[PDB]
Amino acid sequence: HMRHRTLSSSPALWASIPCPRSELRLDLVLASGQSFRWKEQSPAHWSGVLADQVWTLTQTEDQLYCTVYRGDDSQVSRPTLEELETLHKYFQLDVSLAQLYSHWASVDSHFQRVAQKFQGVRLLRQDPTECLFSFICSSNNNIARITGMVERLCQAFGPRLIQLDDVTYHGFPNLHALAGPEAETHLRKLGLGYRARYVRASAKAILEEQGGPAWLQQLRVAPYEEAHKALCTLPGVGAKVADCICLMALDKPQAVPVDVHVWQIAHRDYGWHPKTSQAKGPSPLANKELGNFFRNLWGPYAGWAQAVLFSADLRQ
Ligand SMILES: COc1ncc(Nc2nc(N)nc3[nH]ncc23)cc1Cl
Numbered sequence: 536h537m538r539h540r541t542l543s544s545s546p547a548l549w550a551s552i553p554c555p556r557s558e559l560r561l562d563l564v565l566a567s568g569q570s571f572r573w574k575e576q577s578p579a580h581w582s583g584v585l586a587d588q589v590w591t592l593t594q595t596e597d598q599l600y601c602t603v604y605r606g607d608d609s610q611v612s613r614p615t616l617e618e619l620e621t622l623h624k625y626f627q628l629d630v631s632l633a634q635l636y637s638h639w640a641s642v643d644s645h646f647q648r649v650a651q652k653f654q655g656v657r658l659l660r661q662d663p664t665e666c667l668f669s670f671i672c673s674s675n676n677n678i679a680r681i682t683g684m685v686e687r688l689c690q691a692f693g694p695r696l697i698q699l700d701d702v703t704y705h706g707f708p709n710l711h712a713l714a715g716p717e718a719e720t721h722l723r724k725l726g727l728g729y730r731a732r733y734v735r736a737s738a739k740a741i742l743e744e745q746g747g748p749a750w751l752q753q754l755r756v757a758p759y760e761e762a763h764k765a766l767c768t769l770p771g772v773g774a775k776v777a778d779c780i781c782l783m784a785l786d787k788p789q790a791v792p793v794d795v796h797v798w799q800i801a802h803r804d805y806g807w808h809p810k811t812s813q814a815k816g817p818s819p820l821a822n823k824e825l826g827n828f829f830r831n832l833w834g835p836y837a838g839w840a841q842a843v844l845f846s847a848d849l850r851q
């Protein structure tokens with residue numbers, strides 16, 4: 536049995552990245568339903584899989600500490616340099632949150648009030664595959680049910696990596712694994728309900744119709760609007776999910792996912808009503824309008840601004 540590390544447990548095996556808590560609060564970013572793979576196994580100690588390796592992460596007021604578990608009896612070492620660049624990109628630490636917060640606040644007094652208690656909210660840069668199928672599971676769910684669905688999906692279809700304590704960590708499947716004949720049947724047995732069709736179908740579609748997972752990398756370089764359009768061709772992927780994926784895995788920071796929660800915020804908190812739309816409630820067109828509303832207000836990181844409000848909408 537190998538054990539989940541704390542910073543006490545084994546300070547030999549931790550490395551560190553200079554990170555102000557104001558640029559990144561793990562506790563706000565790892566649970567909040569960007570990823571559904573990180574758990575707080577021990578207090579202030581976040582463990583989950585990234586690119587077929589397990590990590591535990593923790594931080595101070597100016598340091599981000601991390602440790603790696605490779606799997607098959609390699610010899611426990613501290614994170615390498617390459618392994619630390621991986622983790623730097625995932626947090627997109629090149630991006631100054633302080634600068635964006637100040638810009639947003641300058642045009643949005645609502646944001647000024649809210650954002651003081653929610654510093655260090657940034658977007659993860661996720662693997663498009665994992666993001667896509669995670670958000671295909673997102674329809675008509677809460678975060679807890681999705682967390683479960685993804686885990687069970689990974690344990691049943693994904694490579695085993697390592698076991699720590701009672702937790703067996705699997706990597707995310709490849710498209711072939713998800714597009715198999717018995718897939719939906721199995722996924723349905725794992726509690727995914729209707730979504731099981733969309734997972735299998737989208738997997739099968741990305742292979743055949745789109746020419747493998749390279750297609751998703753293309754969308755990452757493709758401009759926002761083309762990426763969105765492209766994603767909406769997939770089974771179970773509509774505007775909202777496409778915008779999630781755009782924002783969280785295809786480097787489109789201006790993507791603003793609109794559902795009924797954001798309708799509610801926009802109306803209550805910003806006094807927004809659909810103008811160029813007739814009908815007084817959600818619709819593909821009115822949603823699209825609301826997205827443009829926020830882009831026009833917050834600028835080309837509108838999605839990142841939104842993420843701060845979202846993170847204030849799960850903390851009462
Ligand atoms: C602005 O940045 C963000 N946008 C969306 C999410 N996550 C979700 N949104 C919605 N409407 N439903 C969800 N179900 N499960 C997750 C999730 C998170 C952020 Cl930070």
Ligand code: NI
Binds near residue numbers: 808
């Ligand atoms: Ni009103």
